[PDB]
Ligand binder design. Structure first.
Ligand SMILES: Nc1ncnc2c1ncn2[C@@H]1O[C@H](COP(=O)(O)OP(=O)(O)O)[C@@H](O)[C@H]1O
Ligand SMILES: Nc1ncnc2c1ncn2[C@@H]1O[C@H](COP(=O)(O)OP(=O)(O)O)[C@@H](O)[C@H]1O
Ligand SMILES: Nc1ncnc2c1ncn2[C@@H]1O[C@H](COP(=O)(O)OP(=O)(O)O)[C@@H](O)[C@H]1O
Ligand SMILES: [Cl-]
Lengths: 89, 89, 89
């Protein structure tokens, strides 16, 4: 049984705004790490959001991209994982 | 040639206990990152353990879940990677 | 459409040297996280580099391994992701 993992790497100023999008979309949780990077090196944030459906991962990704992709640094992608143990998913 | 990657995100108080489980099971190493998150946002820890067999990844995951899943925050999952270069695996 | 994700976990002293290899090879960016670990627990660094081709991921991995694998702690691997949104890739 595959589940989906959405990653969003973006500017630290978006921590609250992106966390709200994740929770309002119905994700059961999220993990965020402090990171740094260079793109198109400075401190930024990396979100990981596990979802039971591709649709939910897409909905979160699409909302973040629609709101912030044009005005903020951002990279995002999805992959699959298995053998999930979670308290509420 | 695929190898396995076990992820365990759990409470920081379990750092030593989970590290011991990983090493006693025979993993060749582990990586741990400081993180934060929300689940079922506060600081926590994310372990990544690469293993040569699914069996070893399962054994570590099963022991952590059996010991701590009922009493501590925890999410865990497995995925595959390739092109491994490691000193001892 | 799959894209590739190269991970390199290595000693913090190599931060600049590995960042230079990544950029000189033509990657569009990279992310780096502070981590800790044990191998063959101390602070180290984890790079993640997304690439449009397996060839580019291999070229970066091969250069890092050729330069530093014999003299420094290092583990590296590759996996795939999808649903990429990036500003320049
Ligand atoms: N090819 C890549 N591999 C890994 N991480 C990347 C890559 N490209 C961008 N990133 C990450 O995403 C962040 C944002 O990138 P981007 O939106 O291109 O603008 P910026 O150059 O301001 O970082 C970077 O700081 C980096 O952390
Ligand atoms: N759907 C999810 N996606 C990403 N990370 C998650 C998810 N659910 C939980 N987590 C991570 O696992 C941690 C533990 O979650 P959980 O055991 O549900 O309880 P808690 O609410 O105390 O965090 C969270 O703090 C978060 O880091
Ligand atoms: N099996 C593994 N799973 C996850 N991370 C690992 C594993 N083996 C090594 N690592 C990571 O790579 C780093 C370097 O490992 P290695 O080169 O074997 O030497 P060291 O023992 O000096 O760390 C470790 O500190 C750890 O972060
Ligand atoms: Cl990570």
């Amino acid at each position: 049984q595959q589940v989906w993992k959405l990653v969003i790497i973006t500017e630290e100023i978006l921590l609250k705004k992106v966390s709200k999008i994740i929770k309002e979309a119905g994700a059961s949780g999220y993990t965020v790490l402090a990171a740094a990077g260079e793109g198109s090196a400075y401190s930024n944030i990396k979100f990981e959001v596990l979802t039971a459906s591709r649709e939910l991962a897409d909905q979160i990704q699409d909302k973040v991209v629609a709101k912030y992709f044009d005005d903020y640094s951002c990279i995002t992608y999805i992959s699959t994982v298995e053998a999930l143990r979670a308290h509420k998913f």
